[PDB]
UniProtKB/Swiss-Prot annotation, chain A:
It comes from Escherichia coli (strain K12). Disruption phenotype: Inactivation results in increased initial adhesion and biofilm formation. GO terms for cellular component: cytosol. One of its GO terms (molecular function) is bacterial-type RNA polymerase core enzyme binding. Enhances distal genes transcription elongation in a specialized subset of operons that encode extracytoplasmic components. RfaH is recruited into a multi-component RNA polymerase complex by the ops element, which is a short conserved DNA sequence located downstream of the main promoter of these operons. Once bound, RfaH suppresses pausing and inhibits Rho-dependent and intrinsic termination at a subset of sites. Termination signals are bypassed, which allows complete synthesis of long RNA chains. It comes from the Bacteria. Belongs to the RfaH family. Pfam families: NusG. SMART domains: NGN. HAMAP family: RfaH. This is Transcription antitermination protein RfaH. Keywords: DNA-binding, Transcription, Transcription antitermination, Transcription regulation. SUPFAM superfamilies: N-utilization substance G protein NusG, N-terminal domain (SSF82679). The N-terminal domain contains a vast hydrophobic cavity that is buried by the C-terminal domain. This cavity may bind the RNAP and become unmasked only upon binding to the nontemplate DNA strand.
UniProtKB/Swiss-Prot annotation, chain B:
DNA-dependent RNA polymerase (RNAP) catalyzes the transcription of DNA into RNA using the four ribonucleoside triphosphates as substrates. It comes from the Bacteria. Belongs to the RNA polymerase beta' chain family. The RNAP catalytic core consists of 2 alpha, 1 beta, 1 beta' and 1 omega subunit. When a sigma factor is associated with the core the holoenzyme is formed, which can initiate transcription. The rRNA transcription and antitermination complex (rrnTAC) consists of RNAP, NusA, NusB, NusE (rpsJ), NusG, SubB, ribosomal protein S4, DNA and precursor rRNA; S4 is more flexible than other subunits. Co-administration of salinamide and rifampicin or salinamide and myxopyronin suppresses the emergence of resistance to both antibiotics. Acetylated on several lysine residues in the presence of glucose. This is DNA-directed RNA polymerase subunit beta'. Transmembrane segments: none annotated. The chain holds residues 246 to 293 of 1407 of the full protein. The lineage of its organism: Bacteria, Pseudomonadati, Pseudomonadota, Gammaproteobacteria, Enterobacterales.
Length: 162, 48
DNA sequence: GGAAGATCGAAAAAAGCACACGCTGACCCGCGTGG
DNA sequence: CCACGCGGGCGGTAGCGTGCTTTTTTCGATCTTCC
RNA sequence: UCUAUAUGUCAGCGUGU
């Protein structure tokens, strides 16, 4: 009978492993959320998964062997405790199907109106209040001078979150 | 201390990195990932 | 008459393998991702 | 085509290994000895 | 002696033993 297994995938290869597994006709589940990342400074709405580099594959070992899945392109290794691979109970799968959080991620640390440190250009090593990308590749900050801070747009890749 | 695991310049624009630095980086990355997963209220198998 | 300890050969794991000097090469993350 | 920033066994839809000696620990199988 | 010149390992060797 079909059972659920947990798979650790390679870095940035979750999508490719997903397509490869769907080619082999095995059901897979992975948490998915679309939200606003910063992506090297350009605030864009894209999709990333909760619990990154993890997949839940439902398959019967009789139909397709475990080693075949282990050798699937884009899949790093089975999540196994002891010799045998781990078995995910159906209750966990149900909870995951109802598991719908709204959170943020470390690459998405700087949101509208927060402290960001500029470390490049003529303003290297200073603190500013960041509000919004104007366009895509231009983000502005409350650049601080000796007297006061004034809004000004700087290159996105130069600054980083504190 | 960093001096006991120095980051010697490679004289070619790169940096020769000791194995201790790599091990510390791996430990720090794993600790940060575990902290994020715990803060995300992840289920039993993933956190284990 | 079944448990306890016991023991005994066999399998698995750990630690070691001299000193000093001179020379050469060959690195000292790669890759999906992003702009 | 110029950075870049995190998992890492590698790569693949599996298997890679493969010429020492001594010491220590533990285990299965038996045994044997009894209360 | 912080006055110049201020790295590591792996592989291949060779020398004295």
């Amino acid at each position: 009978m079909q059972s659920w297994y947990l798979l650790y995938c390679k870095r940035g290869q979750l999508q490719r492993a997903q397509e490869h597994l769907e080619r082999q006709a095995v059901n897979c589940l992975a948490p998915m959320i679309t939200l606003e990342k910063i992506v090297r400074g350009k605030r864009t709405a894209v999709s990333e998964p909760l619990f990154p580099n993890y997949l839940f594959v439902e398959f019967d070992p009789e139909v397709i062997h475990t080693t075949t899945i282990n050798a699937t392109r884009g899949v790093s290794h089975f999540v196994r405790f002891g010799a045998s691979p781990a078995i995910v109970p159906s209750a966990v799968i149900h909870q995951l199907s109802v598991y719908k959080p709204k959170d943020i991620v470390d690459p998405a640390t700087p949101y509208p109106g927060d402290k960001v440190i500029i470390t490049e250009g003529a303003f290297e090593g200073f603190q500013a209040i960041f509000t919004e990308p104007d366009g895509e590749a231009r983000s502005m900050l409350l650049l601080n001078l000796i007297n006061k801070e004034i809004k000004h747009s700087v290159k996105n890749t130069e600054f980083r979150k504190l | 201390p960093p001096d006991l695991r120095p980051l010697v310049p490679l004289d070619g624009g790169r940096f020769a990195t000791s194995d201790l630095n790599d091990l510390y980086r791996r430990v720090i990355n794993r600790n940060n990932r575990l902290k994020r997963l715990l803060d995300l209220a992840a289920p039993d198998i993933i956190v284990r």
